[PDB]
Symmetry: C2
Subunit: 141 residues, 2 copies
């Protein structure tokens, strides 16, 4: 299962990452895998990047922005389509997508959150991720 945030920006679970037919139907070109233990199943069909982002409040989600956002922008620059996925893809993967929208569109946490939540209503970033994103633009700590 897949949220279409933009036509080129998708958010989903590990099951999305392993559903070839739907990856093709959505014209996926790039897959950002922030899960644990999820094999990149289709090496010949997609450009993959992995980065471990554990679903804990202690994870520093902001730390991952340079690497993750460069990849997303790579997909976009090439007029492709990137799927960001994790295990359940409701928390860490959601937070990366929210942050990306915040930075790429210079939009607020609440605006970006709303865009993701409408596209994938099962999102529920952990409290630490919410605090980290809510106070990123203001520069807390």
């Amino acid at each position: 299962q897949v949220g279409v945030i933009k036509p080129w920006l998708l958010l989903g679970s590990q099951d999305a990452a392993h559903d070839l037919d739907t990856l093709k139907k959505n014209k996926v070109t790039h897959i950002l895998n922030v899960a644990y233990g999820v094999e990149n199943a289709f090496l010949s069909d997609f450009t993959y990047k992995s980065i471990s982002i554990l679903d804990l409040p202690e994870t520093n989600i902001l730390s991952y922005f340079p690497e993750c956002f460069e990849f997303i922008e790579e997909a976009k620059r090439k007029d492709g389509v990137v799927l960001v996925h994790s295990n359940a893809g409701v928390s860490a993967a959601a937070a990366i997508v929210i942050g990306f929208l915040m930075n790429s569109e210079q939009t607020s946490f609440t605006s970006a959150f709303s865009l993701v939540k409408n596209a994938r209503p099962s999102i529920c970033p952990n409290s630490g991720f919410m605090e980290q994103l809510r106070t990123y633009q203001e520069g807390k700590e």
Copy 2:
């Protein structure tokens, strides 16, 4: 937090760390199937932890003896158990679905529906769904 029964609750790591809500809901027992979530309130609740990776290769059925024994103990003592994982959407949900099937002889579809109505964000992975579909067939 999803209220599956007044004594069976399903939630996230944030529910496990919210003492005020835990006490409002009369929790007594916490079954922690998360990774990396400290059992914060040892003097207030009875905790049991079990590692359950959210991967389709995980054998969810293997965890049922340990998990269900604990849930049954909370129930026998007229307490209230919170089952939680990290997001509370996949393995913790699978445990709750399986528990209704096992304790109540409920069908998979009915049990799944009960859990999904109490917590619409649930989505056990493809492996867990197939394991639960054929459980007690």
